[PDB]
Amino acid sequence: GPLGSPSKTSNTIRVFLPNKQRTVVNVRNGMSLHDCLMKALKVRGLQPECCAVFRLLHEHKGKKARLDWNTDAASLIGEELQVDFL
């Protein structure tokens, strides 16, 4: 029984999963991006070879921004990320 809650601040980010799949994750202060995929993957147990993340620019219309995998996950909270092969 989803959809039906007041407006509140939730610490979660949108990760891009292949096959049109989408899942949000909550991170603790001092967390890294490498860890941001641990919570989403923990549920499916899928071990990939190479993955890369990109955060979308909120200043322009819709560009691509390369970020570090060891970057603070709580710093990109409420935003969206995108991972690709190699």
UniProtKB/Swiss-Prot annotation:
Expression across tissues: In skeletal muscle, isoform 1 is more abundant than isoform 2.
Signal peptide location: none
Top-rank taxon: Eukaryota
All copies of domain RBD, residue ranges: 11-86
Localization (cell): Cytoplasm; Cell membrane; Mitochondrion; Nucleus
Entry's disease: Noonan syndrome 5: A form of Noonan syndrome, a disease characterized by short stature, facial dysmorphic features such as hypertelorism, a downward eyeslant and low-set posteriorly rotated ears, and a high incidence of congenital heart defects and hypertrophic cardiomyopathy. Other features can include a short neck with webbing or redundancy of skin, deafness, motor delay, variable intellectual deficits, multiple skeletal defects, cryptorchidism, and bleeding diathesis. LEOPARD syndrome 2: A disorder characterized by lentigines, electrocardiographic conduction abnormalities, ocular hypertelorism, pulmonic stenosis, abnormalities of genitalia, retardation of growth, and sensorineural deafness.
Function: Serine/threonine-protein kinase that acts as a regulatory link between the membrane-associated Ras GTPases and the MAPK/ERK cascade, and this critical regulatory link functions as a switch determining cell fate decisions including proliferation, differentiation, apoptosis, survival and oncogenic transformation. RAF1 activation initiates a mitogen-activated protein kinase (MAPK) cascade that comprises a sequential phosphorylation of the dual-specific MAPK kinases (MAP2K1/MEK1 and MAP2K2/MEK2) and the extracellular signal-regulated kinases (MAPK3/ERK1 and MAPK1/ERK2).
Identification of the protein by name: RAF proto-oncogene serine/threonine-protein kinase
Species whose genome carries this gene: Homo sapiens
